[PDB]
């Protein structure tokens, strides 16, 4: 479960991200695609090259969803319910891929938060992204 | 790697398998147990209930195709990557199947063999089949890029 | 989440286990130790030989906990509270190992309950073992 | 298989890494982020808070040794199983270390490199490092039995 300190840490870090969240979302997907090539199987309709507008557009959506989750950190299942449905019943991405994107999101944050990404903040963000992931796969079966 | 005894154990049990039956069953169970795997089979018709999935003729047909290829691969236990390379390329390049699905099918297959053979599917036999399904899954994911 | 049908399925199948729960727990552990030998790092203190009293005894502990969990399927976190504490605070089991033992328990049940292990029951059992696993790792951080 | 470009990327970034400091940072972060891994370091003293873990002399010393071995492995990217065999056996037989921790440390190390280097740890550099930490973890788990 996310503690009060975890929530504080997530809000501070995401708050520093601020307006760059969409850019960071796309960077994290780029990071994922290159680092873990099997994740590209869910995007055969995308141009996955660097700078693709498709990745950027999807990065903005992912980031906006994360912003939404941060904003409703005590009520994540309902905030992400439409996304849990979509992933469970339409996209059907294997649950294992969420850990790969969560690591890349973490890496993206680390590369952009020199001051903020302390060990404790890293720990909270890892927990938060795992919790988001759990919510997103909660309706798979 | 499988030991000589493990190879023999795999070969002996597989000689008793009805590949089309076990294939239909393992694929159906994959679709029931891990329902997101139904995403590749939207053209297959009714998949609305466990009974419909299991009784779906297209699911059964796909299962025999998949397990027939698995079956044929058991003759090339020391060349699984070579044996499955072209199928790996196809699954990645044209079918866009996430290789985790190979691991999931492998685990359902082990559960089906356990169900089918009961006490004959001993711990050592299972251990041997785990190497096989891991090896096949790794071979099918090997050419992904 | 465990649906009501899932709970029905688990209670029926696990009730059939009955007096064999201890023997099945031990067999599941032996299946795990032989299939996934890295799991043995958690039991270096044990005589892991086939038929060992220690494995039989630990198998009964594991099975009785599963019996407890099935019995209190609507409140697993509470019912397994001391065990989730123990695993989180005293043991050092990476969460990956829970999937491995869960798969070995399914194999065990499949091998011993031909009539009860249907596709639907298999799915229910898998979900239940995943849920137990989640409860047991819930206090890790 | 690291490409040539991937090997160059790994090497160029590693020339800037202070192995002792990064080792200490990465091991400390592993113990803070996945605190059950503290169970493998029972005699290391105070691990009570994040600051205590990061500042612990034993953690810093151990991290220097662990990353020093990782560093030496980077000279043998084509033979990681052979390069880490002795340490794999040690980690299994004497240390009883759950091998998933090799993967976790690899990922924490990638996060430290991203934090420390910022923008120069590009997506392509990261991908090269992911193949390396996957290879090292596989190599360290290879002799488990
Ligand atoms: C933090 C974890 C994730 C979040 C917050 C997230 C969020 C989203 C959002 C907000 C959308 C767009 C929904 C819409 O268009 O209505 C989406 C779509 C999608 N997601 Fe997820 N996602 C996550 C993880 C993943 C992962 C790990 C994968 C696969 C590797 C994935 C694959 C997809 C795909 C293929 C689409 C459809 C994209 C398109 O065709 O435009 N997602 N996701
Ligand atoms: C033991 C692992 C597997 C083996 C050996 C295997 C083998 C095969 C073979 C031989 C084909 C036909 C190739 C052709 O048309 O030229 C095929 C097609 C296909 N496979 Fe795989 N398969 C495996 C696992 C899976 C899994 C787990 C899935 C999805 C959950 C999957 C999805 C598909 C699909 C969607 C097709 C195309 C079928 C069609 O067009 O009717 N396969 N597979
Ligand atoms: C279905 C999942 C599991 C259940 C229900 C379970 C249950 C238990 C129980 C009831 C105990 C005994 C505590 C006592 O004596 O009061 C125990 C201890 C233990 N478990 Fe878990 N466990 C599970 C998964 C695992 C896994 C996957 C591992 C490692 C591979 C593991 C490693 C251990 C160890 C090392 C001990 C201590 C044994 C001893 O020294 O006697 N457990 N577990
Ligand atoms: C990059 C992967 C790793 C490498 C290359 C590595 C390397 C080493 C080396 C070289 C030693 C002996 C140091 C000496 O000469 O004194 C050692 C010891 C040890 N390592 Fe690993 N290690 C790795 C990961 C881990 C992880 C992830 C854990 C645990 C979570 C771990 C647990 C230990 C322990 C407990 C010892 C013995 C420490 C003591 O003496 O108390 N190692 N490792």
XYZ file of C-alpha atoms and ligand atoms in Angstrom:
744
model
C 0.000 0.000 0.000
C 1.209 3.551 -0.534
C 2.120 5.324 2.672
C 1.566 8.988 3.395
C 5.300 9.499 2.818
C 5.062 7.612 -0.455
C 2.198 9.786 -1.578
C 4.088 12.901 -0.550
C 7.121 11.767 -2.470
C 5.081 10.863 -5.562
C 3.299 14.221 -5.593
C 6.531 16.164 -5.150
C 8.317 14.274 -7.909
C 5.391 14.369 -10.347
C 4.877 18.023 -9.421
C 8.495 18.762 -10.452
C 7.883 16.904 -13.740
C 5.071 19.305 -14.240
C 4.475 20.286 -17.835
C 7.123 17.907 -19.121
C 5.034 14.871 -18.155
C 3.949 14.199 -21.758
C 7.488 14.466 -23.045
C 8.642 12.135 -20.243
C 5.842 9.713 -21.047
C 6.990 9.480 -24.661
C 10.624 9.154 -23.631
C 9.728 6.292 -21.320
C 7.867 4.474 -24.121
C 10.921 5.020 -26.410
C 13.091 3.671 -23.643
C 10.827 0.659 -23.305
C 10.703 -0.099 -27.023
C 14.438 -0.012 -27.415
C 15.289 -1.760 -24.178
C 12.624 -4.449 -24.295
C 11.836 -5.106 -27.949
C 9.034 -7.610 -27.238
C 6.913 -4.670 -26.058
C 6.735 -3.475 -29.666
C 4.349 -6.327 -30.465
C 1.513 -4.226 -29.060
C 2.219 -1.395 -31.474
C 2.549 -2.789 -35.026
C 0.461 0.099 -36.305
C 2.991 2.655 -34.966
C 6.002 4.332 -36.374
C 8.278 3.746 -33.354
C 11.185 5.775 -34.625
C 12.705 8.464 -32.479
C 10.502 11.513 -32.441
C 7.457 9.728 -33.816
C 4.296 11.726 -33.266
C 2.506 8.452 -32.559
C 4.788 7.717 -29.609
C 4.596 11.310 -28.445
C 0.795 11.286 -28.649
C 0.646 8.024 -26.766
C 3.247 9.295 -24.292
C 1.023 12.250 -23.533
C -1.924 9.939 -22.870
C 0.088 7.692 -20.551
C 1.449 10.688 -18.691
C -1.956 12.311 -18.392
C -3.281 9.040 -16.893
C -0.381 9.090 -14.423
C -1.183 12.698 -13.536
C -4.790 11.603 -12.970
C -3.599 8.741 -10.773
C -1.371 11.094 -8.729
C -4.314 13.428 -8.324
C -6.517 10.582 -7.079
C -3.819 8.597 -5.308
C -6.278 7.545 -2.549
C -8.839 6.364 -5.174
C -6.854 4.953 -7.993
C -9.034 2.016 -9.026
C -11.944 4.290 -9.910
C -9.791 6.965 -11.611
C -8.198 4.364 -13.819
C -11.298 2.167 -14.281
C -11.861 3.005 -17.952
C -8.213 2.332 -18.568
C -8.377 -0.940 -16.633
C -11.303 -1.961 -18.857
C -9.559 -0.943 -22.020
C -6.414 -2.806 -21.243
C -8.229 -5.840 -19.905
C -10.817 -6.263 -22.634
C -9.465 -4.601 -25.726
C -5.710 -4.042 -25.743
C -4.952 -7.129 -23.743
C -1.279 -6.345 -23.106
C 0.426 -9.097 -21.087
C 0.744 -7.978 -17.471
C 4.502 -8.517 -17.525
C 4.913 -5.485 -19.798
C 3.659 -3.093 -17.161
C 6.794 -3.727 -15.067
C 8.925 -2.908 -18.094
C 7.175 0.387 -18.739
C 7.237 1.211 -14.996
C 11.013 0.666 -14.923
C 11.409 2.902 -17.989
C 9.203 5.564 -16.435
C 11.403 5.399 -13.336
C 14.502 5.696 -15.444
C 13.021 8.625 -17.321
C 12.262 10.362 -14.015
C 15.772 9.646 -12.689
C 17.364 11.169 -15.809
C 15.300 14.304 -15.397
C 15.186 14.706 -11.600
C 18.759 15.073 -10.343
C 17.694 16.598 -7.076
C 14.390 14.854 -6.501
C 15.239 11.274 -7.290
C 16.632 10.341 -3.857
C 16.584 6.711 -2.702
C 13.379 7.310 -0.798
C 11.667 9.032 -3.732
C 12.821 6.251 -6.029
C 11.299 3.710 -3.633
C 7.984 5.583 -3.497
C 7.771 6.028 -7.234
C 8.501 2.328 -7.758
C 5.662 1.469 -5.427
C 3.309 3.921 -7.082
C 3.967 2.656 -10.572
C 3.533 -0.928 -9.375
C 0.240 0.081 -7.811
C -0.895 1.757 -11.054
C 0.142 -1.349 -12.889
C -1.841 -3.571 -10.546
C -4.903 -1.400 -11.039
C -4.471 -1.528 -14.809
C -4.375 -5.317 -14.854
C -7.003 -5.785 -12.128
C -9.788 -6.669 -14.545
C -7.867 -9.005 -16.801
C -9.590 -12.084 -15.448
C 19.854 -28.704 -20.747
C 17.892 -31.917 -20.356
C 19.773 -34.916 -19.031
C 19.654 -38.159 -20.996
C 17.159 -39.577 -18.480
C 15.071 -36.434 -18.747
C 15.029 -36.653 -22.526
C 13.851 -40.249 -22.362
C 11.230 -39.346 -19.821
C 9.872 -36.599 -22.094
C 9.868 -38.909 -25.106
C 8.173 -41.728 -23.219
C 5.300 -39.640 -21.921
C 4.774 -37.856 -25.225
C 4.339 -41.188 -27.007
C 1.097 -41.492 -25.055
C -0.211 -38.067 -25.999
C -3.072 -37.477 -28.438
C -1.582 -34.277 -29.843
C -4.785 -32.909 -31.380
C -6.728 -33.536 -28.167
C -4.062 -32.133 -25.882
C -3.489 -29.199 -28.253
C -7.183 -28.274 -28.371
C -7.312 -28.567 -24.579
C -4.156 -26.556 -23.856
C -5.106 -23.737 -26.224
C -8.658 -23.662 -24.934
C -7.372 -23.598 -21.351
C -4.978 -20.815 -22.308
C -7.916 -18.751 -23.522
C -9.964 -19.564 -20.425
C -7.307 -19.223 -17.729
C -5.559 -16.163 -19.291
C -8.384 -14.551 -21.256
C -6.394 -11.659 -22.629
C -4.831 -14.239 -24.942
C -8.167 -14.271 -26.801
C -7.061 -11.012 -28.466
C -5.412 -12.911 -31.303
C -8.505 -14.985 -31.955
C -11.290 -12.494 -32.511
C -12.120 -14.201 -35.834
C -12.620 -17.570 -34.115
C -16.243 -17.157 -33.203
C -17.830 -17.873 -29.903
C -15.454 -17.526 -26.973
C -18.102 -16.335 -24.548
C -17.906 -19.051 -21.909
C -15.375 -21.665 -20.822
C -17.526 -24.288 -22.483
C -17.765 -22.278 -25.696
C -14.001 -21.712 -25.824
C -13.236 -25.347 -25.161
C -15.780 -26.546 -27.688
C -14.904 -23.957 -30.353
C -13.811 -25.805 -33.471
C -11.436 -23.023 -34.553
C -9.769 -23.000 -31.106
C -9.448 -26.741 -31.397
C -8.075 -26.428 -34.912
C -5.495 -23.841 -33.862
C -4.518 -25.986 -30.892
C -3.736 -28.953 -33.093
C -1.629 -26.715 -35.365
C 0.298 -25.228 -32.449
C 0.798 -28.486 -30.578
C 1.681 -30.390 -33.795
C 4.545 -27.894 -34.242
C 5.504 -28.265 -30.584
C 5.329 -32.015 -31.006
C 7.599 -31.986 -34.040
C 10.055 -29.797 -32.080
C 10.485 -32.548 -29.469
C 12.527 -34.369 -32.049
C 15.021 -31.435 -32.030
C 15.602 -30.839 -28.345
C 19.244 -29.867 -29.023
C 18.299 -27.390 -31.787
C 15.222 -25.667 -30.496
C 16.333 -22.207 -31.696
C 17.090 -23.489 -35.139
C 13.871 -25.456 -35.271
C 11.647 -22.556 -34.301
C 13.542 -19.647 -35.862
C 11.228 -19.128 -38.835
C 8.220 -19.495 -36.552
C 9.833 -17.009 -34.181
C 10.282 -14.507 -37.027
C 6.650 -15.007 -38.118
C 5.213 -14.642 -34.621
C 7.182 -11.437 -34.154
C 7.007 -9.854 -37.585
C 3.548 -10.789 -38.775
C 1.496 -12.161 -35.924
C 2.713 -9.753 -33.224
C 2.384 -12.309 -30.464
C 3.958 -11.219 -27.192
C 6.377 -14.032 -26.299
C 5.001 -14.163 -22.751
C 2.089 -16.108 -24.378
C 4.552 -18.899 -25.136
C 5.409 -19.155 -21.443
C 1.770 -19.084 -20.481
C 0.893 -21.759 -22.968
C 3.812 -23.815 -21.673
C 2.503 -23.624 -18.146
C -1.023 -24.540 -19.248
C 0.393 -27.441 -21.213
C 2.157 -28.730 -18.086
C -1.088 -28.425 -16.143
C -2.863 -30.388 -18.914
C -0.261 -33.097 -18.937
C -0.591 -33.335 -15.147
C -4.369 -33.575 -15.483
C -4.142 -36.143 -18.198
C -1.458 -38.425 -16.778
C -2.105 -37.944 -13.056
C 0.478 -39.697 -10.895
C 2.525 -40.660 -13.929
C 3.386 -36.963 -14.330
C 5.795 -37.180 -11.377
C 7.935 -34.323 -10.026
C 10.985 -35.420 -12.037
C 8.877 -35.788 -15.211
C 7.432 -32.362 -14.612
C 10.909 -30.962 -14.058
C 11.901 -32.346 -17.446
C 8.800 -30.864 -19.156
C 9.518 -27.479 -17.531
C 12.873 -27.416 -19.254
C 11.160 -28.312 -22.539
C 8.459 -25.673 -22.385
C 10.989 -23.057 -21.223
C 13.289 -24.081 -24.067
C 10.496 -23.912 -26.689
C 9.279 -20.554 -25.404
C 12.805 -19.174 -25.454
C 13.268 -20.519 -28.984
C 10.036 -18.929 -30.197
C 11.024 -15.582 -28.671
C 14.579 -15.706 -29.930
C 14.170 -13.864 -33.204
C 12.015 -11.114 -31.835
C 13.499 -7.681 -32.504
C -10.330 -10.175 -7.790
C -12.003 -13.438 -6.836
C -15.515 -13.668 -8.147
C -18.177 -15.584 -6.277
C -17.988 -18.335 -8.874
C -14.240 -18.399 -8.319
C -14.833 -18.780 -4.580
C -17.347 -21.547 -5.188
C -14.898 -23.278 -7.459
C -12.018 -23.044 -4.987
C -14.012 -24.229 -2.020
C -15.250 -27.259 -3.917
C -11.896 -28.215 -5.328
C -9.937 -27.475 -2.166
C -12.547 -29.292 -0.065
C -11.938 -32.394 -2.162
C -8.296 -32.170 -1.123
C -9.450 -32.674 2.423
C -7.127 -34.856 4.451
C -4.514 -34.911 1.682
C -3.809 -31.167 1.911
C -0.555 -31.879 3.780
C 0.652 -34.494 1.309
C -0.245 -32.233 -1.610
C 1.567 -29.304 -0.052
C 4.720 -31.385 0.255
C 4.420 -32.679 -3.275
C 3.936 -29.147 -4.557
C 7.115 -28.103 -2.713
C 9.019 -31.050 -4.121
C 7.722 -30.217 -7.620
C 8.967 -26.648 -7.132
C 12.390 -27.644 -5.810
C 13.008 -29.975 -8.738
C 11.446 -27.847 -11.470
C 12.802 -24.497 -10.287
C 15.953 -25.222 -8.293
C 16.666 -21.583 -7.555
C 13.747 -21.795 -5.093
C 15.911 -23.994 -2.889
C 17.936 -20.917 -1.801
C 15.101 -20.205 0.635
C 15.517 -23.595 2.357
C 19.243 -24.153 2.797
C 18.581 -25.326 6.364
C 16.358 -28.173 5.206
C 16.783 -31.768 4.369
C 15.146 -31.450 0.947
C 15.462 -35.133 0.051
C 12.343 -36.831 -1.197
C 10.121 -37.845 1.697
C 11.876 -35.676 4.284
C 9.979 -35.005 7.442
C 10.866 -31.334 7.161
C 9.295 -30.952 3.716
C 6.227 -32.922 4.765
C 5.834 -30.732 7.825
C 6.348 -27.543 5.863
C 3.956 -28.851 3.186
C 1.273 -29.275 5.895
C 1.934 -25.739 7.151
C 1.506 -24.353 3.633
C -1.639 -26.422 3.001
C -3.299 -25.513 6.294
C -2.657 -21.844 5.492
C -4.370 -22.410 2.124
C -7.167 -24.171 3.964
C -7.461 -21.134 6.210
C -7.447 -18.822 3.197
C -10.190 -20.762 1.349
C -12.264 -20.782 4.508
C -11.889 -17.046 4.908
C -11.785 -16.271 1.188
C -13.636 -12.974 1.641
C -10.955 -11.696 4.094
C -7.617 -13.198 3.198
C -5.495 -10.222 4.232
C -6.863 -10.528 7.736
C -6.756 -14.318 7.892
C -3.182 -14.493 6.676
C -2.019 -11.478 8.595
C 0.679 -13.206 10.646
C 1.962 -14.965 7.544
C 2.150 -11.780 5.471
C 4.103 -10.284 8.417
C 6.484 -13.230 8.569
C 7.163 -13.284 4.853
C 7.658 -9.527 4.669
C 9.775 -9.075 7.773
C 11.687 -12.262 8.417
C 11.977 -14.043 5.055
C 13.487 -12.900 1.795
C 11.460 -14.539 -0.877
C 11.466 -12.629 -4.104
C 7.812 -12.454 -5.258
C 8.664 -14.405 -8.380
C 8.877 -17.539 -6.244
C 5.204 -17.304 -5.309
C 4.268 -17.782 -9.015
C 6.489 -20.833 -9.113
C 4.976 -22.513 -6.052
C 1.477 -21.510 -7.235
C 2.115 -23.212 -10.590
C 3.383 -26.321 -8.720
C 0.293 -26.395 -6.512
C -1.890 -26.240 -9.644
C 0.062 -29.077 -11.148
C -0.356 -31.033 -7.944
C -4.098 -30.495 -7.846
C -4.381 -31.328 -11.535
C -2.520 -34.585 -10.986
C -4.668 -35.525 -8.018
C -8.155 -34.200 -8.874
C -8.973 -35.382 -12.409
C -12.707 -34.897 -12.041
C -12.500 -31.469 -10.358
C -9.797 -29.782 -12.439
C -11.979 -28.342 -15.229
C -10.952 -25.277 -17.278
C -13.107 -23.018 -15.172
C -11.833 -24.465 -11.886
C -8.268 -24.268 -13.168
C -8.767 -20.571 -13.853
C -10.328 -20.046 -10.416
C -7.578 -21.898 -8.635
C -4.943 -19.927 -10.505
C -6.582 -16.670 -9.572
C -6.888 -17.790 -5.935
C -3.254 -18.749 -5.643
C -2.300 -15.423 -7.196
C -4.476 -13.666 -4.667
C -2.922 -15.550 -1.768
C 0.479 -14.678 -3.183
C -0.498 -11.016 -3.336
C -1.598 -11.130 0.285
C 1.646 -12.775 1.310
C 3.850 -10.106 -0.371
C 1.577 -7.169 0.512
C 3.718 -5.934 3.411
C 7.070 -6.288 1.707
C 7.499 -2.526 1.396
C 24.034 -10.054 -28.036
C 25.275 -6.538 -27.722
C 25.735 -4.898 -31.112
C 29.036 -3.117 -31.779
C 27.298 0.191 -31.291
C 25.841 -1.188 -28.049
C 29.280 -2.328 -26.854
C 30.749 1.086 -27.634
C 27.922 2.779 -25.788
C 28.510 0.625 -22.708
C 32.243 1.253 -22.784
C 32.089 4.987 -23.271
C 29.694 5.491 -20.426
C 31.625 3.121 -18.134
C 34.798 5.228 -18.514
C 32.955 7.973 -16.582
C 31.670 5.702 -13.804
C 33.332 5.854 -10.425
C 32.781 2.160 -9.692
C 33.226 2.475 -5.968
C 30.706 5.330 -5.663
C 28.187 3.935 -8.132
C 28.484 0.471 -6.529
C 27.729 1.917 -3.114
C 24.807 3.910 -4.507
C 23.294 1.006 -6.360
C 23.599 -1.489 -3.488
C 22.210 1.061 -1.062
C 19.296 1.799 -3.371
C 18.607 -1.908 -3.728
C 18.291 -2.200 0.064
C 16.111 0.900 0.309
C 13.835 0.194 -2.708
C 13.464 -3.582 -2.061
C 14.000 -3.732 1.702
C 13.616 -7.476 2.044
C 16.994 -7.729 0.340
C 18.434 -6.408 3.632
C 17.924 -10.000 4.788
C 21.035 -10.971 2.855
C 23.131 -8.409 4.807
C 22.218 -9.257 8.414
C 25.631 -8.300 9.779
C 26.021 -4.942 7.996
C 24.908 -2.739 10.820
C 22.444 0.011 10.675
C 19.969 -0.308 7.835
C 17.135 1.415 9.656
C 16.454 4.373 7.380
C 17.330 5.334 3.800
C 20.036 7.694 5.043
C 21.451 5.008 7.294
C 21.566 2.492 4.464
C 23.155 4.873 1.994
C 25.697 6.078 4.531
C 26.561 2.624 5.936
C 30.232 1.873 5.494
C 29.620 -1.868 4.977
C 27.068 -1.196 2.281
C 29.459 1.204 0.578
C 32.285 -1.282 0.836
C 30.252 -4.177 -0.405
C 28.812 -2.139 -3.249
C 32.367 -1.276 -4.295
C 33.218 -4.993 -4.376
C 30.055 -6.050 -6.199
C 30.292 -3.355 -8.871
C 34.050 -3.961 -9.184
C 33.201 -7.533 -10.235
C 30.484 -6.232 -12.542
C 33.026 -3.801 -13.952
C 35.493 -6.562 -14.584
C 32.697 -8.461 -16.391
C 32.377 -5.636 -18.919
C 35.694 -6.694 -20.404
C 34.109 -10.078 -21.219
C 30.717 -9.241 -22.711
C 30.787 -12.216 -25.047
C 31.464 -14.688 -22.181
C 29.446 -13.587 -19.210
C 28.450 -17.121 -18.150
C 32.101 -18.111 -18.005
C 33.264 -14.909 -16.382
C 30.716 -15.152 -13.549
C 30.606 -18.945 -13.076
C 32.697 -18.988 -9.877
C 30.686 -16.157 -8.381
C 27.425 -17.870 -9.503
C 28.374 -20.999 -7.645
C 29.364 -18.931 -4.615
C 26.039 -17.069 -4.595
C 24.095 -20.289 -4.842
C 26.063 -22.702 -2.630
C 27.371 -20.469 0.089
C 25.377 -17.251 0.058
C 21.926 -18.683 -0.721
C 21.040 -15.522 -2.668
C 17.723 -15.548 -4.545
C 18.845 -14.920 -8.139
C 16.014 -12.529 -8.876
C 18.057 -10.005 -6.837
C 20.644 -9.928 -9.645
C 17.913 -8.646 -11.916
C 16.744 -6.154 -9.327
C 20.252 -4.799 -8.727
C 20.704 -4.508 -12.509
C 17.603 -2.381 -12.746
C 18.597 -0.202 -9.737
C 22.008 0.237 -11.325
C 20.306 1.395 -14.551
C 18.302 3.868 -12.492
C 21.474 5.155 -10.771
C 23.222 5.628 -14.097
C 20.171 7.491 -15.386
C 20.123 9.691 -12.235
C 23.817 10.374 -12.194
C 24.269 10.945 -15.930
C 20.947 12.554 -16.848
C 20.487 13.250 -20.537
C 23.639 11.437 -21.685
C 22.023 8.161 -20.539
C 19.950 8.145 -23.727
C 17.361 5.526 -24.696
C 19.904 3.697 -26.858
C 22.576 3.794 -24.099
C 20.009 2.468 -21.691
C 19.066 -0.361 -24.058
C 22.713 -1.436 -24.277
C 22.952 -1.394 -20.485
C 19.748 -3.406 -20.196
C 21.229 -6.203 -22.297
C 24.344 -6.136 -20.118
C 22.540 -6.270 -16.780
C 20.279 -9.031 -18.128
C 23.346 -10.961 -19.276
C 25.151 -10.519 -15.948
C 22.114 -11.597 -13.962
C 21.657 -14.615 -16.210
C 25.362 -15.439 -15.845
C 25.213 -15.111 -12.079
C 22.187 -17.404 -11.895
C 23.548 -19.902 -14.396
C 25.303 -22.193 -11.962
C 22.427 -22.410 -9.531
C 21.278 -25.972 -8.925
C 1.712 3.116 -16.574
C 1.207 2.102 -17.333
C 0.220 2.471 -18.460
C -0.613 3.483 -18.570
C -0.889 4.600 -17.544
C -1.300 3.375 -19.826
C -2.246 4.247 -20.297
C -2.796 4.196 -21.567
C -3.646 5.236 -22.109
C -3.992 6.464 -21.276
C -3.972 4.864 -23.323
C -4.873 5.590 -24.353
C -6.355 5.269 -24.116
C -7.320 5.808 -25.137
O -6.880 6.076 -26.265
O -8.518 5.924 -24.808
C -3.339 3.588 -23.591
C -3.441 2.891 -24.788
C -2.594 1.858 -25.103
N -1.723 1.199 -24.220
Fe -1.594 1.494 -22.230
N -0.839 2.272 -20.508
C 0.088 1.694 -19.680
C 0.819 0.572 -19.953
C 0.832 -0.004 -21.197
C 1.775 -1.027 -21.597
C 2.850 -1.596 -20.669
C 1.511 -1.357 -22.850
C 2.182 -2.351 -23.808
C 3.471 -2.559 -23.880
C 0.386 -0.573 -23.278
C -0.141 -0.647 -24.562
C -1.088 0.251 -24.970
C -1.568 0.279 -26.325
C -1.113 -0.643 -27.466
C -2.487 1.262 -26.385
C -3.249 1.697 -27.652
C -2.446 2.796 -28.386
C -3.045 3.263 -29.713
O -3.333 2.393 -30.557
O -3.146 4.494 -29.868
N -0.002 0.257 -22.248
N -2.637 3.196 -22.492
C 4.141 -23.791 -28.302
C 4.083 -22.548 -28.773
C 3.552 -22.262 -30.186
C 3.836 -22.861 -31.335
C 4.806 -24.012 -31.613
C 3.080 -22.203 -32.379
C 3.071 -22.577 -33.698
C 2.322 -21.981 -34.695
C 2.230 -22.419 -36.060
C 2.937 -23.664 -36.627
C 1.439 -21.557 -36.698
C 1.016 -21.536 -38.179
C 2.023 -20.794 -39.051
C 1.674 -20.498 -40.473
O 0.484 -20.232 -40.764
O 2.580 -20.520 -41.318
C 1.034 -20.551 -35.753
C 0.191 -19.494 -36.073
C -0.349 -18.660 -35.126
N -0.004 -18.649 -33.786
Fe 1.450 -19.701 -32.869
N 2.336 -21.199 -31.822
C 2.614 -21.210 -30.483
C 2.051 -20.388 -29.534
C 1.128 -19.411 -29.839
C 0.430 -18.648 -28.849
C 0.598 -18.854 -27.325
C -0.365 -17.790 -29.497
C -1.337 -16.757 -28.952
C -1.853 -16.686 -27.734
C -0.150 -18.003 -30.914
C -0.802 -17.307 -31.915
C -0.792 -17.660 -33.230
C -1.606 -17.047 -34.248
C -2.610 -15.920 -33.973
C -1.342 -17.646 -35.383
C -1.943 -17.421 -36.793
C -3.140 -18.368 -36.998
C -4.051 -18.165 -38.168
O -3.804 -17.258 -38.997
O -5.043 -18.923 -38.269
N 0.772 -18.999 -31.108
N 1.575 -20.848 -34.519
C 1.062 -20.315 -1.398
C 2.101 -19.554 -1.008
C 2.725 -19.750 0.380
C 2.136 -20.055 1.533
C 0.642 -20.297 1.821
C 3.173 -20.086 2.546
C 2.938 -20.376 3.875
C 3.929 -20.499 4.819
C 3.724 -20.935 6.199
C 2.347 -21.325 6.725
C 4.909 -20.942 6.785
C 5.252 -21.358 8.232
C 5.314 -20.284 9.303
C 5.212 -20.900 10.692
O 5.903 -21.902 10.949
O 4.409 -20.348 11.458
C 5.887 -20.513 5.821
C 7.227 -20.363 6.027
C 8.181 -20.269 5.078
N 7.949 -19.977 3.727
Fe 6.142 -19.450 2.989
N 4.384 -19.809 1.976
C 4.150 -19.597 0.655
C 5.090 -19.266 -0.310
C 6.443 -19.367 -0.060
C 7.444 -19.400 -1.097
C 7.142 -19.293 -2.598
C 8.630 -19.544 -0.526
C 10.010 -19.641 -1.159
C 10.243 -20.252 -2.314
C 8.395 -19.597 0.915
C 9.425 -19.745 1.808
C 9.188 -19.986 3.148
C 10.206 -20.236 4.124
C 11.717 -20.299 3.853
C 9.608 -20.376 5.306
C 10.218 -20.711 6.691
C 10.409 -22.210 6.872
C 11.048 -22.745 8.129
O 12.187 -22.343 8.408
O 10.367 -23.584 8.775
N 7.054 -19.464 1.169
N 5.266 -20.238 4.613
C 25.988 -7.456 -10.139
C 25.640 -8.582 -9.497
C 26.581 -9.027 -8.354
C 27.900 -9.238 -8.355
C 28.831 -9.107 -9.562
C 28.290 -9.649 -7.045
C 29.593 -9.922 -6.663
C 29.958 -10.286 -5.389
C 31.328 -10.419 -4.921
C 32.542 -10.123 -5.822
C 31.283 -10.823 -3.668
C 32.470 -11.086 -2.706
C 33.204 -9.836 -2.252
C 34.561 -10.020 -1.630
O 35.517 -10.342 -2.355
O 34.600 -9.839 -0.391
C 29.906 -10.932 -3.284
C 29.461 -11.310 -2.030
C 28.154 -11.251 -1.637
N 27.081 -10.908 -2.430
Fe 27.099 -10.623 -4.427
N 27.180 -9.678 -6.207
C 26.121 -9.305 -7.010
C 24.830 -9.163 -6.573
C 24.426 -9.483 -5.301
C 23.088 -9.256 -4.793
C 21.984 -8.610 -5.657
C 23.010 -9.727 -3.557
C 21.879 -9.770 -2.551
C 20.722 -9.211 -2.539
C 24.340 -10.238 -3.232
C 24.665 -10.788 -2.005
C 25.965 -11.013 -1.621
C 26.361 -11.393 -0.285
C 25.368 -11.563 0.874
C 27.676 -11.529 -0.304
C 28.543 -11.903 0.907
C 28.730 -10.573 1.724
C 29.339 -10.852 3.077
O 30.518 -11.191 3.026
O 28.639 -10.736 4.105
N 25.152 -10.067 -4.309
N 29.108 -10.620 -4.359
